[PDB]
């Protein structure tokens, strides 16, 4: 059975794209092995439904990630942070897209991404919650607004809640992580007024002889 040593990465850090997990991009496993030595080194985040997400990725068996052309009209892309530096360079989750002010401007976004393939798409995205109100308006002109991610089966509304969070590597703020599955013939539709940590594409999601295990045993 094909073993993938998670080393210093957790399955979710490997998923999201934590800089020190770039080696895990698009990898497969019959068994993913999480080590107790693992850490995170990127923006502070919270995955409500963490355990569920970890489980469904583990039994899918791979992190095959396919990029997609989302049309983010009038908004600055590829934001980064001190909390997620690659070396001395500000970086971010390699599968997430931090949208923000472009020339002191932020328009509401309304984008769709139709699934016309023969398989299910897994979209991982999030929502940024600023520490202060100044932080809100600097990054997204507009005050706290909503994120609405809808399909023909699901519905996911998130309201950003501004407030001081626990200090993690330079930041007193946090990102909420959410996931969506889009069936063939279904369509991913994102309406966002701001605070959206956008998806860069999708994971091909399946199910099979695939799992995950926690262990510090030497793979030999």
């Amino acid at each position: 059975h094909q073993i993938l040593d998670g080393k210093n990465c957790t399955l979710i850090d490997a998923l999201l794209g934590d800089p020190h997990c770039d080696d895990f991009q698009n990898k497969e496993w019959d068994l993913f092995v999480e080590r107790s030595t693992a850490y995170s080194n990127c923006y502070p985040y919270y995955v409500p439904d963490y355990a569920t997400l970890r489980s469904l990725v583990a039994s899918s068996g791979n992190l095959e990630f396919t990029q997609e052309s989302f049309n983010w009209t009038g908004v600055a892309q590829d934001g980064s942070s001190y909390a997620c530096r690659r070396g001395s360079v500000n970086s971010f989750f390699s599968r997430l897209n931090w949208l923000y002010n472009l020339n002191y401007k932020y328009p509401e976004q309304n984008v769709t991404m139709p699934n016309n393939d023969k398989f299910d798409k897994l979209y991982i995205w999030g929502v940024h919650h600023p520490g202060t109100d100044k932080d809100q308006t600097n990054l997204y002109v507009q005050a706290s607004g909503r994120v609405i991610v809808s399909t023909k089966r699901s519905q996911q509304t998130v309201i950003p809640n501004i407030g001081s969070r626990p200090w993690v590597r330079g930041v007193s703020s946090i990102i909420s992580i959410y996931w969506t599955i889009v069936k063939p013939g279904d369509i991913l539709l994102i309406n966002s007024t701001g605070n959206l940590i956008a998806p860069r594409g999708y994971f091909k999601i399946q199910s099979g002889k695939s799992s995950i295990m926690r262990s510090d045993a030497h793979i030999d």
Partner: antibody, heavy 127, light 108 residues
């Protein structure tokens, strides 16, 4: 611009190891990515791992994983391809290549179009 | 694993004619992550097209790129004797994969 310059052709026996260099420009090395791609009969083109010398960060293909190492030398602007535990089907021409887009700190494109290419290095594996 | 299937295997046309090359992918590939290459016997691949229709620096305008989803195209408007080479498509939406190649012969 750079005109990537690789090592010369090699001959290795099965179970041995190569190191194939690539010499880049200051710009190519510190603000672009370097990729290895190999070619053979029946293997039209095979993307092997890639590197961002600027970060030292890597991504390898599983096919060559825990065998293929991609390292750099910042003082010479060179990227090295160390394929270990050589197999007869590793006989191929190994090219280095540059990522067409420039480095994006938030999302290092290890998967890209390949702008400039090295001359190719034939590694023959045989006893 | 995105499979790239090129059509035809071999194409033979005289100078001045238009060459049309086709590429079929196993997954829907965004047209902003697809490239075309030229490889003349013994050379390294030369980037012709990136972003499906964006022409690379130092490439002639007779080289045209098109396509979307799974159906992509390379058009060579006015063949020269210099265009005798193998052509390749590549997707870069996931870890880079390439086609089997199309061999273009120039008639004489």
């Amino acid at each position: 611009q750079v005109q990537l310059v690789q090592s010369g052709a090699e001959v290795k026996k099965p179970g041995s190891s190569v190191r194939v260099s690539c010499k880049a420009s200051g710009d190519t090395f510190s603000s672009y990515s370097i990729t290895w791609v190999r070619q053979a009969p029946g293997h039209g083109l095979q993307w092997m791992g890639g590197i961002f010398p600027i970060f030292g960060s890597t991504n390898y293909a599983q096919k060559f994983d825990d065998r293929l190492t991609i390292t750099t030398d910042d003082s010479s602007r060179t990227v090295y391809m160390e394929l270990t535990s050589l197999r007869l089907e590793d006989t191929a021409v190994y090219y280095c290549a540059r990522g067409a887009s420039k480095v994006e700190p938030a999302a290092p494109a290890y998967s890209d179009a390949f702008d400039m290419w090295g001359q190719g290095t034939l590694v023959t594996v045989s006893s | 694993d995105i499979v790239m299937t090129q059509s035809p295997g071999t194409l033979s046309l005289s100078p001045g004619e238009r060459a049309t090359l086709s590429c079929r992918t196993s997954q829907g590939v965004s047209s902003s992550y697809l490239a075309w290459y030229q490889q003349k016997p013994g050379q390294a691949p030369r980037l012709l097209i990136s972003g499906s229709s964006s022409r690379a620096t130092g490439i002639p305008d007779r080289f045209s790129g098109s396509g979307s989803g799974r159906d992509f195209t390379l058009t060579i408007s006015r063949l020269e004797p210099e265009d005798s080479a193998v052509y390749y498509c590549q997707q870069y939406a996931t870890s880079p994969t390439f086609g089997q190649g199309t061999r273009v012969e120039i008639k004489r």
